[PDB]
Amino acid sequence: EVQLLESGGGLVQPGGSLRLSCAASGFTFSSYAMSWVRQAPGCGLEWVSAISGSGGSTYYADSVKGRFTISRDNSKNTLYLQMNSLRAEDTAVYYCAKYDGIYGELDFWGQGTLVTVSSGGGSGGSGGCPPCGGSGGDIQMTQSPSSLSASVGDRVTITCRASQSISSYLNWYQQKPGKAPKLLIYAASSLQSGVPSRFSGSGSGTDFTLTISSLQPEDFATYYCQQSYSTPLTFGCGTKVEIK
């Protein structure tokens, strides 16, 4: 079993510091880049930072540049996120994820740790949900529809549009309430091992589709697309598939 176990969340005061860790096991740690991905309460997925397998290259979303430091200890099989000058808007669950060097999908996720940045003066400082689908200079991911109502047995198709051509470096994830995301499709159309055959994807360039050929009860969840063409790795806003 691949295992990723995060530690270090908790309550922190604005301006304070936190150091997250993620202990890896069940795969050759130094053979994979790793990512941190966060999800503010009731919001979508936002990519935070990435580090190369050697540790020599690091990448950051612009909102955490200079405050956050990603690092790794390949002898200890541990990934770190040092977070300084924390802001209310950093409140989120933080996930570490293993990155695959060929297609760029995040194929295994930890279970997340909750970071609450608060001084008790109201929850409005967090700014609510951030702008999903990307920010300044990012590849924008437009996911449609935002929500849909369907029933067991229906065929449903979700679409995802990138602001530039990304060839087939597009991934789809499923997230159930209170759970970490799970990779469904990578490279636009390849099924991840263990994923039911009722899921399929297609497309290349800017336009992509995810189809569930027959909606089963366990498939009511939120689905996110994600481009892995270029850093910052952008997630769509998500489609919620709910019962009618």
Side-chain angles (χ1 to χ4, degrees), residues 2-244:
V2 172
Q3 305 256 323
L4 299 168
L5 217 199
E6 298 98 340
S7 304
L11 178 73
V12 60
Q13 310 291 316
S17 297
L18 230 54
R19 191 208 59 171
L20 304 181
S21 49
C22 170
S25 70
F27 64 96
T28 317
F29 187 59
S30 58
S31 293
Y32 299 92
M34 303 283 304
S35 268
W36 288 99
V37 173
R38 69 180 177 194
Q39 184 170 38
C43 305
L45 304 167
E46 181 182 36
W47 177 87
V48 175
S49 179
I51 182 168
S52 69
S54 73
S57 295
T58 60
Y59 308 93
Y60 302 94
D62 288 332
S63 61
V64 308
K65 284 183 160 293
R67 309 191 283 118
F68 292 15
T69 301
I70 189 177
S71 63
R72 63 192 299 154
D73 189 337
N74 288 335
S75 70
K76 279 176 206 156
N77 280 6
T78 297
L79 175 72
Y80 304 95
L81 191 58
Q82 180 62 45
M83 310 160 83
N84 299 326
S85 296
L86 281 168
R87 304 168 193 161
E89 58 253 48
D90 297 313
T91 293
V93 169
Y94 285 76
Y95 306 101
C96 58
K98 184 172 82 98
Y99 171 101
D100 162 71
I102 295 294
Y103 299 110
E105 78 268 22
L106 298 178
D107 59 4
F108 287 91
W109 298 57
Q111 291 306 303
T113 185
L114 173 66
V115 173
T116 303
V117 184
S118 167
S119 61
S123 309
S126 73
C129 294
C132 53
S135 329
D138 299 348
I139 294 171
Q140 305 288 322
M141 300 309 284
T142 303
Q143 213 177 315
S144 192
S146 39
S147 58
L148 64 92
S149 51
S151 11
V152 179
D154 292 4
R155 165 190 292 246
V156 287
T157 55
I158 296 173
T159 70
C160 175
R161 172 177 306 158
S163 60
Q164 62 166 60
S165 179
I166 60 184
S167 307
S168 287
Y169 303 112
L170 190 278
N171 317 295
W172 293 96
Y173 306 84
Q174 177 184 65
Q175 186 172 42
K176 292 149 163 163
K179 276 301 300 166
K182 175 185 67 178
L183 171 71
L184 290 180
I185 303 289
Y186 66 93
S189 61
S190 299
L191 261 76
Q192 175 65 16
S193 149
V195 173
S197 112
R198 64 175 181 280
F199 294 92
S200 64
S202 65
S204 73
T206 57
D207 294 274
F208 304 85
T209 60
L210 175 73
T211 306
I212 313 171
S213 68
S214 294
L215 217 55
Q216 307 195 5
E218 51 276 37
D219 298 337
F220 295 93
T222 301
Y223 296 90
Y224 298 92
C225 65
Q226 182 251 325
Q227 65 87 7
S228 53
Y229 187 89
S230 182
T231 246
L233 311 170
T234 307
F235 295 83
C237 290
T239 298
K240 183 164 271 195
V241 181
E242 50 187 89
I243 314 92
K244 75 142 298 170

